[PDB]
Structure 1
Amino acid sequence: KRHGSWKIQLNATSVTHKPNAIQMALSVCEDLISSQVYAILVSHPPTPN
């Protein structure tokens, strides 16, 4: 809205829970390195582990 008139755009990608902790980072790497992300934020308090 207020960040100028430059032709940059934004796309959203959020990955959800997996019970296995290795496949968490596996889904993250194959879904965000191919997406060429610039920042990674994790917001999960309610994990049983």
Structure 2
Amino acid sequence: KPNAIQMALSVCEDLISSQVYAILVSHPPTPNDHFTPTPVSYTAGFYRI
């Protein structure tokens, strides 16, 4: 998602609700540094995903 805090809630609602064993992330097309990887690594790391 374009915004930040909505990305964090969207990860657990859609991904870990399907019993995922690992998550793949990629840099966003826009040239903004460390935007996508921080919300994912803080929610998946809660469960050691």
TM-score for the superposition, normalised by structure 1: 0.50
Compute the TM-score of the two structures, normalised by the length of structure 2. Answer: 0.50
In terms of fraction of residues, the more helix-rich structure is 2
| Rg (Cα) greater in structure | 1
